[PDB]
Amino acid sequence: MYIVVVYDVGVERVNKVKKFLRMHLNWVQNSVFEGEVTLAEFERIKEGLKKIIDENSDSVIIYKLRSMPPRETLGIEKNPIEEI
């Protein structure tokens, strides 16, 4: 299962979640993470995120995709994942 994790966590909290998602998924642009997870690790992410992040303020979206989606990027590509 391939997910792309997008979020809106505001300030003075994000750095611990940003360092969290770097240990599991890849980094594409500012505040966008994607990577290959198993049915166990998806739970680990959402669990860790649930306990690191505070609800009723912030927002996190996780799209559940079957395989690597094609993409067209503009501006500067701070990290390309297309090269695998």
Binding site: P80, E83, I84
Partner: protein, 311 residues
């Protein structure tokens, strides 16, 4: 329009009108339109449908060795072409004086980056006295005799920044018996590839060259132009990767000859390469093409060829 490097061992094919990549495990990614070059670093089977399709689309497949060394190229048929330019390419090769200008200009332009490269790193730089030795030399072999010296001395005085494990005593062509000569020759290989690609995108025939004798299967125009872009891309990546510490001996493995990178070394170097091959200047990749256009600008007689130094 990016390129691709597929490390995983799968099978390229074309089920419905698109390309698809099946790794042994199983999936099917890869929209085509949006990729420009395919680099095969793994053991990947290709099907005649996607191989005929890739040719029909004007994409070329660059194959590479087990060790990262350029193995060959799959050259499709020539989409955008001109023989009125190629005839001039050959006139410039045949006429030695005008060949001498451009052949010399490449070393004039590239070794110039090297001085300005090492200069950006806060070290002594005096290459100007060697340029005179080139400008006087008339024969091709002597212009080479210089670059065979300049290339090996640049390394010698680059070494007084880096740690021992990453030292470059000499260049050691395939196979190198030291460390850090894999990273450079491998990083160089991809620059060679990217060169063979961005040359295709022009009307220049890649097999007529000035500072390199062309052969049927040889791309000597990429080699000629490579002399300029190695210090811009190869050296700078090979530097900015070794310094901040993203690659260590855990990434280097040895054979009888001690040349090889682990898939993590190849992938990280490949990543950093793909990352820095386009940051901004509004692209670093296009510069490969524009520098090729400059030849077009000199080959007609619009503007004399001026090589690239640094933005």
């Amino acid at each position: 329009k990016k390129s691709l490097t597929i490390f995983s061992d799968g099978t390229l094919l074309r089920r419905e009108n698109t390309l698809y990549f099946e790794n042994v495990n199983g999936r099917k990614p890869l929209a085509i339109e949006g990729i420009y070059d395919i680099y095969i670093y793994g053991h990947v089977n290709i099907t005649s449908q996607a191989l005929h399709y890739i040719a029909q689309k004007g994409i070329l497949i660059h194959f590479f060795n087990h060790y990262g060394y350029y193995d060959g190229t799959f050259y499709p048929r020539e989409t955008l072409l001109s023989g009125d330019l190629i005839i001039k390419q050959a006139e410039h090769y045949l006429d030695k004086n005008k060949r001498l200008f451009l052949a010399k200009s490449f070393v004039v332009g590239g070794a110039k980056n090297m001085e300005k490269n090492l200069k950006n790193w806060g070290i002594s730089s005096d290459f100007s006295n060697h340029l005179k030795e080139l400008q006087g030399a008339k024969k091709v072999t002597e212009i080479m005799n210089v670059e065979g010296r300049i290339r090996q001395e640049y390394y010698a005085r680059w070494d007084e920044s880096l740690p021992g494990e990453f030292r470059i005593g000499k260049r050691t062509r395939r196979p190198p018996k030291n460390e850090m000569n894999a990273l450079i020759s491998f990083l160089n290989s991809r620059l060679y590839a990217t060169m063979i690609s961005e040359i295709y995108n022009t009307q220049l025939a890649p097999t007529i060259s000035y500072l390199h004798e062309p052969s049927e299967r040889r791309f000597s125009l990429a080699l000629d132009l490579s002399e300029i872009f190695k210090p811009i891309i190869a050296d700078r990546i090979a530097n900015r990767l070794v310094k901040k510490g993203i690659i260590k001996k855990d990434h280097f493995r040895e054979d009888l000859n001690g040349v090889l990178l682990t898939d993590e070394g190849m992938k990280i170097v490949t990543k950093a390469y793909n990352q820095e091959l386009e940051k901004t200047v509004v692209t670093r990749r296009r510069l490969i093409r524009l520098e090729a256009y400059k030849i077009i600008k000199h080959l007609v007689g619009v503007e004399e060829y001026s090589p690239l130094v640094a933005w």
